[PDB]
Amino acid sequence: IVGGTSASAGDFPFIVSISRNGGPWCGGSLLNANTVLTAAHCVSGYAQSGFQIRAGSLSRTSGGITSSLSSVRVHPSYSGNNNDLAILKLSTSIPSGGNIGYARLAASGSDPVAGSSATVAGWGATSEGGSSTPVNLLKVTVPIVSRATCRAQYGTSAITNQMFCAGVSSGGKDSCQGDSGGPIVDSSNTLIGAVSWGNGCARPNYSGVYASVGALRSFIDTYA
């Protein structure tokens, strides 16, 4: 997260850090006791044994409850940046309670409205190409950017109906490397997406691009 602030305890009861080979990697969202939603690119074709999930903590390295993976299912239409979601099943079920909770999801067929305020959270770099990552969870609030404006930024084919965009024209507030797969929420804390991709981080006139939960609910509901 670039231009972020510290997440408070219980801000995103469902957020998970996804470590790989013991180091930072991605984020995720706990859908239920044995299931995490993340970005396909966080996991697709990698050794599953490499991943560890941690829930119920603002730290990625200590506290809360952890789990290895039992399986990984990518979106059936995952291709390049498109349909960038994956369902992980957990080896160890994680109960709700305390600072752990399950995500509520954007309605099927919903699409974030331009100018509405979204909040995105992670343990990614606080600058583009940053090699140091914060221990504690950061968050930033940025407005939804219209698909039409985002297509003017990235090209028509680049931004699909299963993506939405968010950011500020000026830059300076965005998700970055290490934030992939983690939650972006509407003003109500409903899960609207997962961190997916973009042109660098926090650049003027290049929105963050997110995999749309509203657009990809059949996949999520079928395998959660």
Residues found near Cl ion in the complex (CB under 5 A):
168-170, 216, 218-219
Which amino acid does the sequence have at 75?
H
Q: Please tell me which residue in 57, 67, 84, 212 is annotated as part of the active site.
A: 84
Q: Which is nearer to Cl ion, 21 or 77 (CB)?
A: 77
d(CA 184, CA 170): 20
d(CA 104, CA 191): 6
State in angstroms the smallest separation of the CB of 100 from Cl ion.
27
CB closest to Cl ion, residue no: 219
Residue 75 annotated to the active site: no
Encoded tokens for 98: 């305390």
The HSE-up count of residue 152 (CA atoms within 13 Å, CB side) is 7
Yes or no: say if 54 and 29 are a contact pair by the CB < 8 Å rule. Answer: no
d(CA 158, CA 42): 19
State in angstroms the smallest separation of the CB of 193 from Cl ion.
14
Tokens 């059949």, located at residue: 218
State in angstroms the smallest separation of the CB of 166 from Cl ion.
12
Q: Which is nearer to Cl ion, 97 or 109 (CB)?
A: 109
Residue 41 annotated to the active site: yes
Q: Please tell me which residue in 180, 196, 207, 212 is annotated as part of the active site.
A: 180
Q: Which is nearer to Cl ion, 210 or 219 (CB)?
A: 219
Q: Which residues are catalytic?
A: 41, 84, 180
